[PDB]
Structure formats: structure tokens, C-alpha cells
Amino acid sequence: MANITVFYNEDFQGKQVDLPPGNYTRAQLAALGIENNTISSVKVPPGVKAILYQNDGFAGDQIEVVANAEELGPLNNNVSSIRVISVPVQPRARFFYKEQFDGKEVDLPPGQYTQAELERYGIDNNTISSVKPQGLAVVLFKNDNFSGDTLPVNSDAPTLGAMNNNTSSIRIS
Ligand SMILES: [Ca+2]
Ligand SMILES: [Ca+2]
């Protein structure tokens, strides 16, 4: 019942398409219609972990995700091959764009992120705000390699766009 959902245009914009898990490429896609510069944004719920592949035929710099990716990454200039495999259930956290549990919503599973993936994997170098732990507590860092001042969000906070200065790294515990 799971299935990844891509977006034609960037910024989580542009008609989306639901593709079933499993491994496939330009061949299967040829059957559909989309291919190449199209898988701009992505949205993949838990229960499964996806792996993207720039060049078709499963080649080129690959990627790995299990949540949504408003801004995939630099290699987003070309996409066609992918690989998805079911995965155990894992809680996560939910962040909102505007300060008011609103605006572009993004979420990430438990783990660690830096000033590169995090931003280009859920939001960006900043503009976070209101957070809502969907299952695990969230901790923010104000420096690369998660090393410096921090703000451990041990609970609900539908408003935080006034403290986290430049979120360089995070740790969903
Ligand atoms: Ca963009
Ligand atoms: Ca806020």
C-alpha cells in the first residue's frame, strides 16, 4: 500500500505522480511517461526507504531517503533510475514553514543531519519555525558538524521562528 510520490516542478510544486516501490528505471517509466528532468521534489512516507539514481540504468550519484525532500539536491538536474525497499516502522518529527504550525510542512526520521543534507533534504539553510514532534524529540544545532550552541526541543512548540539561529545541524532523538 506504500508508494513514493514525486513532483514535476521544484519547491514541492508541479503535478505529482505516485510510483510503486521496487526497483525500476527508464524502462518501466517508459511505460508511464515521465522521465529525466522531472523527479524534482519527493514525498515518501515511513514504512519504506527509497534510493534514487541520477543516470538511468541505476547509475550516477545516488541518493537515499525515507521522508520528503522539498529540495532533492544538486544532482536533481537529472533523474530516471530508483530503488525502493520496504522498511520497519519508524516515528519522526514534523516541522512547519510559517510561524504558526502552517506553511510548507516537512518531516524527518530519527537520526542526524548536517548543514547540507538537512537543508536540501527537508527545507533549507534556515526558515524553520513551529515544530511538532510526531514521535521523537527534536534537537537543533547552530553550527556545522553539529558542534556549538543548541536548543533541545523536548516537547510541542507550534512556534520557534525566533530562537533557532541558522539551523546548521539537527538530531532527532
Ligand atoms: Ca527550488
Ligand atoms: Ca515559531
Side-chain angles (χ1 to χ4, degrees):
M1 45 172 272
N3 37 271
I4 64 172
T5 290
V6 317
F7 273 74
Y8 239 76
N9 303 181
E10 190 154 84
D11 210 319
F12 194 69
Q13 183 162 194
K15 322 305 302 320
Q16 47 249 178
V17 170
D18 47 285
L19 310 151
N23 53 106
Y24 66 90
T25 197
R26 191 198 199 307
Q28 210 76 70
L29 285 184
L32 312 191
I34 184 181
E35 41 170 288
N36 215 62
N37 287 224
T38 67
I39 309 196
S40 184
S41 238
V42 124
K43 192 250 188 196
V44 172
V48 18
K49 171 247 293 101
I51 305 168
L52 301 61
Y53 266 98
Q54 192 194 266
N55 284 181
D56 58 76
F58 314 96
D61 294 80
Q62 42 160 210
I63 321 185
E64 191 193 326
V65 304
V66 200
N68 64 251
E70 305 301 86
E71 304 273 52
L72 219 84
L75 67 144
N76 189 267
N77 295 116
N78 180 99
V79 192
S80 317
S81 273
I82 341 184
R83 255 240 77 318
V84 193
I85 321 184
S86 50
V87 123
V89 299
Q90 292 271 32
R92 53 198 166 282
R94 196 173 191 168
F95 304 74
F96 279 113
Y97 228 59
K98 296 277 274 303
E99 188 165 50
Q100 30 24 178
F101 51 97
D102 282 320
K104 267 169 74 273
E105 53 103 51
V106 155
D107 61 273
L108 309 160
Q112 291 78 67
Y113 308 67
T114 88
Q115 200 179 36
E117 144 172 313
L118 201 198
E119 26 169 67
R120 286 99 85 123
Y121 177 55
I123 38 268
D124 212 340
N125 306 83
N126 202 46
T127 163
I128 303 279
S129 329
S130 311
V131 197
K132 189 189 288 314
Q134 172 50 44
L136 319 118
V138 176
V139 180
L140 291 97
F141 300 63
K142 300 150 158 58
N143 191 237
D144 190 51
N145 54 286
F146 34 99
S147 186
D149 184 49
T150 75
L151 206 186
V153 190
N154 51 224
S155 82
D156 311 308
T159 162
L160 216 71
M163 198 66 198
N164 51 353
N165 178 278
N166 283 80
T167 287
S168 281
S169 330
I170 49 166
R171 186 180 157 143
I172 288 197
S173 184

